[PDB]
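Task: complex structure prediction.
Instruction: return structure tokens for all chains below.
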Amino acid sequence: AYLWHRTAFILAYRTPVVPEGAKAGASFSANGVALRWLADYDYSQLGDRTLLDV
Amino acid sequence: NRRDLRDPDRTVIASELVEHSFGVTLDKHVYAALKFTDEQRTLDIRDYTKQVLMP
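Output:
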């Protein structure tokens, strides 16, 4: 069990900025944390790639 | 040309007209390239325009 005051622990979150060169991705939420979704097509590997990060 | 007057040799020398030319070619490709990581674009660039594009 853990009994802690509000000031004991601190979290910080930053949603990465979708760059200009990437096709405009969406933005999701994980328990109030804004996640950046980004999709890019690999012509060389003939496949789609997706990344959801924070 | 030129010949004497009342000259028994009455031949005329024909002149010639020659045109010329010169060629202009596209030969060069000037460019400026930059690359920025996602962290560098998120936490490091404040104003993209005056900090990246104008230089």
